[PDB]
């Protein structure tokens, strides 16, 4: 296993997107994860529809908030997901038009890892790193400091237990800088935000739940490589 790794350099990651005034980080992390898993498995990178999730994932609550795993389940259940092109983003709740979509990227299954207090931080870090090496994963996180972030490695700043789950990001890799380990996370607030739309989240900080609770709930789409 590499000291560092970054999928955003391997051509399996779409450009950073902008969610606008809609609480859809959950959907962008889900589309982001699906885009990667699909490019890794099949070799084609295509942008996918966050709007279809916002409109069709009835378990979530559209622009108010939602879930990554529920997005993945919906995609398995509905034969796949429409592309960004065929089902454009509007940043507002709309009627589900999934039945009107002719083309879709499909996934084989999906995983979820809900950390328990029986696990240690080391083990949470170990398994997460393992999942990321295989493919980018989506994690829930408390984004209370995000409006303030502009660069460098974020250490949790004002986050504190109990961590709120008000946003999702896409972990695409990890690296180091002067002995400080970090995850490379793709955000969805435009390319001008943070480090070209990404935020480096410090890891191994000691808290089992990680920075702002990002170790808590991981979920990712599963796709068997194409022959």
């Amino acid at each position: 296993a590499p000291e560092s790794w970054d999928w955003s350099k391997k051509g399996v990651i779409t450009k950073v997107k902008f969610q606008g005034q809609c609480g859809s980080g959950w959907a962008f992390s889900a589309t982001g994860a699906i885009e990667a898993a699909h490019a890794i498995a099949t070799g084609n990178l295509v942008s996918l529809s966050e709007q279809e999730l916002i409109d069709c994932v009835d378990e979530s609550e559209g622009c108010y908030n939602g879930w990554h795993y529920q997005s993945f389940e919906w995609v398995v259940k509905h034969g796949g997901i429409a592309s960004e092109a065929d089902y454009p983003y509007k940043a507002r709740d709309g009627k589900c038009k999934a039945n009107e979509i002719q083309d879709k990227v499909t996934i084989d299954n999906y995983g979820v890892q809900i950390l328990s207090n029986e696990s240690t931080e080391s083990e949470a870090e170990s398994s997460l790193q393992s999942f990321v090496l295989e493919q980018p994963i989506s994690v829930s996180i408390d984004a209370k400091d995000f409006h303030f972030y502009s660069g460098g490695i974020y250490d949790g700043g004002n986050c504190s237990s109990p961590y709120g789950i008000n946003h999702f990001v896409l972990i695409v890799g990890y690296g180091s800088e002067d002995g400080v380990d970090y995850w490379i996370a793709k955000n969805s607030w435009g390319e001008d935000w943070g480090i070209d739309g990404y935020i480096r989240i410090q890891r191994n900080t000691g808290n089992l739940l990680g920075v702002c609770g990002m170790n808590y709930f991981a979920s990712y789409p599963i796709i068997e490589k194409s022959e």
């Binding site: 902008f18 969610q19 606008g20 005034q21 809609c22 609480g23 859809s24 980080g25 959950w26 622009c63 108010y64 908030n65 939602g66 984004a143 209370k144 995000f146 008000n166 946003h167 607030w189 435009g190 935000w193």
Partner: peptide, 5 residues
């Protein structure tokens, strides 16, 4: 509830 840009 969910954060927005």
């Amino acid at each position: 509830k969910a954060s927005v840009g």
